[PDB]
Structure 1
Amino acid sequence: LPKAEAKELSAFVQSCVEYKTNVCFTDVAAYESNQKGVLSSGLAVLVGTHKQLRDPAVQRLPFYNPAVAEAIERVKEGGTYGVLVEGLANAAGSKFVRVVVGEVPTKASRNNCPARPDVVTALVTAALDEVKEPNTTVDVFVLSNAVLPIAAAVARCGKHNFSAKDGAAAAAYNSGKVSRLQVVFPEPPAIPPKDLEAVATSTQLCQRLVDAPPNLLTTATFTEIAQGYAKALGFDVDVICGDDLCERGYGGIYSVGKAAFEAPRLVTLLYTPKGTPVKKVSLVGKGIVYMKLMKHDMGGAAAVFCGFLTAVRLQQPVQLSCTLCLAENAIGPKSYRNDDIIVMKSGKTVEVINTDAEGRIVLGDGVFHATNELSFTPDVVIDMATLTGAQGIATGRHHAGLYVNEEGAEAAMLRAGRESGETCFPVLYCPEYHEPEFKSNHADMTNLMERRDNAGVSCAGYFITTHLSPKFTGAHIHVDLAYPVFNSNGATGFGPALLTEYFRKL
C-alpha cells in the first residue's frame, strides 16, 4: 500500500519478467574459431572425470601447461585444485590466469544421473569462490557431453542472481556478484546453445522465485510476473481471484488463503503448439506463503511455471496448462480454522483436522480445475509441491518423491530425472491402504492422516488424487520436492529441467 513498497514490488516484478541467464554455451572448436585461444578472463575452470581429464584432447586446450597437468595429478575426487599460469593470453589484462581443475566421480548408483551433475555444480561453485572482480566472463571447460544436465548444473552453481546484499535492494534485488559463465563442451552440443540458454534461464528464474522472500514474491507479484511473461511470449493467462474462488466453488484454495492481505488466486497458463501435439499435459503447482522448509515453499509453483516457460521458448510440441495455486496462509479474523468443513471444487467435503496441512487442499482444487475446467482434458497431470517433511525422511535431499498411478509414467519421469540430473525416486502407491487414514465422522475425508507413520508422502498424494475429475483417465504424477528445491546456499532451481526432459521424450 505505501508508495515506497509499491515502487519496490514493481521493480521486483520487472526483474523477474526480464531475467536473462548469465550462462552461455559453445564448444572447443567454435571457441578456437571465435576467441582464437584468448581466454575470456583471468579465470578458467576445467571439469571432468579422472579418465576424461587424462584424455589427449585435454593437452590441446588453450590453457594447458605442465602446471595444469600437475593439478590433474594432485586434485582429489570431488575436489578442486588451482594453479596460476603466467602470461597466458586473455581478454581481461591479467598477468596470470587461474586454472581450476575439478574431478567428477564416475561412481553413480542406478537411481542417479551417471554424469554426476551434483558434483559438477559443487566444483564450479568452489572454483568461482576465487573470483574477486565480478564483471568477468569465466570459461568453464567441461569434458562431459551430457549437455542438458551440465547446463542446469552450471545454471544452479555459484553466487545466486537473487541478492539483497550490499545495496542490491536498490537494484531490484539483482546480484552484482555473479560472473558470466561460458560453458565449453568438447563437441557441438546435441541441443543447440540458444535452447540450453533457455533451460539455464528457467533454472535460474525458478531459483530466483524460490530464493525471494515472501515480502517480494507474493500471490500478487507472482501473478503479475506470469502476466508479464504471457504478454511477452504470447500465451494465455486466466486468473480466478479472491471472492470469485468462493462464488465459483473453489472452497479449498478460498478457505486457505481467505484471511490474507493479498487475495488467493488460481492462475492458469495455456500453451498450444503450432503443430499437432504429442501429448496434452497439465501442470499444477503449490505456492504457499506462510522447519526451515517454509523458506522454499514456492518451490513447486516456481518449478511448473519455469518448466512451462521453457516449453514455450523451445516450442516443445506439447499442449500445456500450468495452474499455480497461490495463497497466503495467514493468521487473522476471517481465517480458516481447525475443524472447518470445506466444500472442495470437486464436490467432496474435507474436514480440516490440522491447518498446517493446507498445501494438499489448495492442490486438490488445482488438480480438479486442471482436469475438469479447461478447454482440453489432459492425458497427464503432474503436480509439484514442497509438501511433506516425510519426503526427506523417505527419499532424501536429492531425490523428489514420486507418487504415480501408472508404472509407465513413473518409469518415464524417473528416466527424465536421471537424464536431467533432477533426480526422483518412487514412494508407495497403494490407495487401498492410504484411504482409511482419511476417515472422517462428518465429511467425506479429513485433510490429514490419522497415523503419521503409515506412508506419509504417499498419503498426501492420495489426498490429492481424490479431487481429480472423473473426466480424467490418464497418468497422474505427484512430485513431492520439499527438500530437493534447496540446499545450504538457498534454492536449487530443481524441477523445470526435469519437466523439460520429460517433455522431450514424450
Structure 2
Amino acid sequence: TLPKAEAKELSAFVQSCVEYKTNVCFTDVAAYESNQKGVLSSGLAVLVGTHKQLRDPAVQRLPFYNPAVAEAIERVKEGGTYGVLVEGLANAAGSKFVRVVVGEVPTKASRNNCPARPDVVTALVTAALDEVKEPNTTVDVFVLSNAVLPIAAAVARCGKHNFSAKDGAAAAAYNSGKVSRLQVVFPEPPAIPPKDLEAVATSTQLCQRLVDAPPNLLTTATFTEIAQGYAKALGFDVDVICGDDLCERGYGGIYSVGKAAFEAPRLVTLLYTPKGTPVKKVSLVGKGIVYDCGGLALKPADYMKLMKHDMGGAAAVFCGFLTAVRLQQPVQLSCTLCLAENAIGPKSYRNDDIIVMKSGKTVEVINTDAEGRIVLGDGVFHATNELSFTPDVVIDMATLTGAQGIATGRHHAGLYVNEEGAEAAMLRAGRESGETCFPVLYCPEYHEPEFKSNHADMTNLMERRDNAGVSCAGYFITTHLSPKFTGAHIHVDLAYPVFNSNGATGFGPALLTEYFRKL
C-alpha cells in the first residue's frame, strides 16, 4: 500500500497521459494567408530550410520577409540559427517587433539517412524556441521542405518537453507550462492530412512523456492503467496478466525478472482489428522495463541513471499502436507490453537461477542485468503462440544493449531480422520517417554457440561478449518464438535513439506508422 498523497499523484499522472493532446498543428502557406491574412500568430516566427530552399523566390512572398530576413539568410551558418527583428509586422500578440529566426538545414545526407535531415530541423526549431518571450503563445514555424511526415515528428520532438516537474508543474500532473503552441506551415497542402499529422505528433510526444517520466510516476501499474485508459477511450481490447498469475501461467521469464519489485510485473496485450480485411497481421512486443537497476547484478550509479528510459521500446510500440487505432490503419495488431521493474531485494532472481520460460525452454541466468531479452522471450512466445491469430510479422522493440550504441550509434536503431525483405522495408520506413535504423549481423549459426549451458537449454548471456552483442541478444529472443510462427521477425534495438541530452526523443512510433503504411 502507498501513501494517499503518492496514490493521488499517480492517478493525476495517469490522467495526464491518457488525455495528452499535442501542442503542434499543421497548415500550408496559402491556407495560412487565407486564414490569418498576413497577421503573425505571435512575436516570434521561425523559418527553416536548406541553403537553396531559403533562396527560392517564393520565400520573398512570405508575410514576414524583408531585407533584414534576407540578411539573416546570408549570415546564418549551416546547422545554425540567426535571428532578426522586424518592426511593425502585424501580429496577434501586438508587439512593436517580431523576431524572425532563420535556420539552415544541411543537404548532405548519406544513403543510411533521411534526405530531409529532420534531425537538424528538430535542433534548429529547439534553438529558435529559446527566443520565446512569453508563454501560452503560438509560434509560426515555416518549413521549406514538403517531407511532411519526418518534419511532423521532428517538430513534435523539438523544444521544451511536455513532461516537466519544474516551477510547480508537479501540482499540475507534470504538464509543462513552458511549452509553446507550434503552427507548422508547409509550402504546399500536406500530402498527409493535418489531423493525421497531429495524431503522429501526439504519439511522438506521448512516447516522449512516458520515457521522460521518472519511475516513481511511470510504474508497471501506471503504465498498465494508461493503456487501459486508452482502451476505454478508443475501444480496443486489453488483456493483463499480472504478478503471481505470470508464474501460475508459465511466464517464468517476465515473472522472475519482475518479482523482486514493489509493483508487480505485467504482461499487457492490446488488440486492434480494423474494419474489413487487414493488409497484414502484425504482433508488436515492447521491452517495458520501467527501471533497470541491474537486479543482483547491480549497475553502478552512472550507468543506472537514465534507466527510466528502459521502457522506451514499450512506449514506442504502445504509441505506434495508438496511432494505428486513431488513423484506422488497415493492419491487424497485437501490442504486448512486457512490464517489469528489474529490482534488487530478497526476492531477486539470481545469477545462477534457472528459469522455465513460457516457451518451455529453460534459461540459466548468468547475469540478471540481461533482463530484457528474458522478458521479451516471454513476450514473443505469447504473441506467436497464445493469441487468437498467428501474426505474419513480429516486431519487438527494446532498449536492449549498450553494444547497440557502439555498433550503430545514437541515431540509428539496430535491426536484427530473419528475412531480407522485412529488413529492407523497415530500413525504408526509417529513412522516410526520419527514425532511422541500420542492420546488425544476422547469423544464428554463429550466435547460438555463445549461449551453451551446462544444465539449462541456454544461458541468458554470451560466453564471449565481443562476438556481435546486438545480434546475440536478438538471437536469444528468437529461440522463444513459437514453432507455429513462420513469418518475419524484426528485432529493433533502440537503446540510444530513444534519448538525447535533452531527454526522450519519442523515437519509434513514427517508424512503425510509416512501416505499416507501406505494408
Q: Distance in 2 between matches of 1:296 and 1:233?
A: 26
CA deviation map 1:315-341 (0-9, x unaligned): 000000000000111111222111000
Q: Distance in 2 between matches of 1:294 and 1:5?
A: 22
CA deviation map 1:9-54 (0-9, x unaligned): 0000000000000000000000001111100000000000001000
Equivalent residues of 1:285, 1:300 under 8 A apart: yes
Q: Distance in 2 between matches of 1:126 and 1:179?
A: 13
Q: Distance in 2 between matches of 1:298 and 1:350?
A: 23
Q: SS of the residue aligned with 1:297?
A: helix
Q: CA deviation at 1:291?
A: 5.2
| Count of aligned residue pairs for this structure pair | 506
Equivalent residues of 1:337, 1:355 under 8 A apart: yes
**CA 1:446/1:465 → structure 2, altered by over 3 Å: closer, same or farther?**
same
Q: Distance in 2 between matches of 1:13 and 1:292?
A: 23
**CA 1:345/1:222 → structure 2, altered by over 3 Å: closer, same or farther?**
same
**CA 1:236/1:381 → structure 2, altered by over 3 Å: closer, same or farther?**
same
| Counterparts of residues 230-245 of structure 1 (less than 5 Å) | 230-245=231-246
Q: Distance in 2 between matches of 1:292 and 1:53?
A: 41
The runs of 4+ residues in structure 1 deviating greater than 6 Å are: none
Q: CA deviation at 1:259?
A: 1.6
Equivalent residues of 1:77, 1:105 under 8 A apart: yes
Q: CA deviation at 1:220?
A: 0.2
TM-score by length of 1: 0.99
Q: CA deviation at 1:275?
A: 1.7
Q: Distance in 1 between matches of 2:306 and 2:446?
A: 28
Q: SS of the residue aligned with 1:141?
A: strand
Q: Distance in 2 between matches of 1:31 and 1:48?
A: 18
Q: CA deviation at 1:261?
A: 1.1
Which consecutive unaligned segments of at least 5 residues does structure 1 have?
none
TM-score by length of 2: 0.97
| Counterparts of residues 459-498 of structure 1 (less than 5 Å) | 459-498=472-511
Alignment of 1:58 with 2:71, yes or no, is no
Q: CA deviation at 1:478?
A: 0.2
Q: Distance in 2 between matches of 1:36 and 1:387?
A: 51
Q: Distance in 1 between matches of 2:99 and 2:480?
A: 57
**CA 1:293/1:405 → structure 2, altered by over 3 Å: closer, same or farther?**
farther
CA deviation map 1:227-265 (0-9, x unaligned): 000000000000000111011100000011112111110
Q: CA deviation at 1:377?
A: 0.4
Equivalent residues of 1:293, 1:483 under 8 A apart: no
Alignment of 1:167 with 2:168, yes or no, is yes
Equivalent residues of 1:285, 1:383 under 8 A apart: yes
Q: SS of the residue aligned with 1:353?
A: coil
Q: SS of the residue aligned with 2:52?
A: helix
Q: SS of the residue aligned with 1:326?
A: strand
Q: Distance in 2 between matches of 1:79 and 1:331?
A: 45
Q: SS of the residue aligned with 2:304?
A: coil
Q: Distance in 1 between matches of 2:341 and 2:119?
A: 33
Q: Distance in 2 between matches of 1:301 and 1:194?
A: 25
CA deviation map 1:297-354 (0-9, x unaligned): 1110000000000000000000000000001111112221110000000000000000
Q: CA deviation at 1:132?
A: 2.5
Equivalent residues of 1:219, 1:263 under 8 A apart: yes
Q: CA deviation at 1:295?
A: 3.4
CA deviation map 1:401-454 (0-9, x unaligned): 000000000000000000000000000000000000000000000000000000
Q: CA deviation at 1:86?
A: 0.3
Equivalent residues of 1:293, 1:482 under 8 A apart: no
Equivalent residues of 1:209, 1:217 under 8 A apart: yes
Q: SS of the residue aligned with 1:298?
A: helix
Q: CA deviation at 1:188?
A: 0.3
Equivalent residues of 1:346, 1:469 under 8 A apart: yes
Find the partner of 1:448 among 444, 461, 466. Answer: 461
Bigger mean CA deviation after superposition, 486-495 or 130-139: 130-139
Q: SS of the residue aligned with 1:244?
A: helix
Equivalent residues of 1:14, 1:225 under 8 A apart: yes
Equivalent residues of 1:147, 1:190 under 8 A apart: yes
Q: CA deviation at 1:292?
A: 3.9
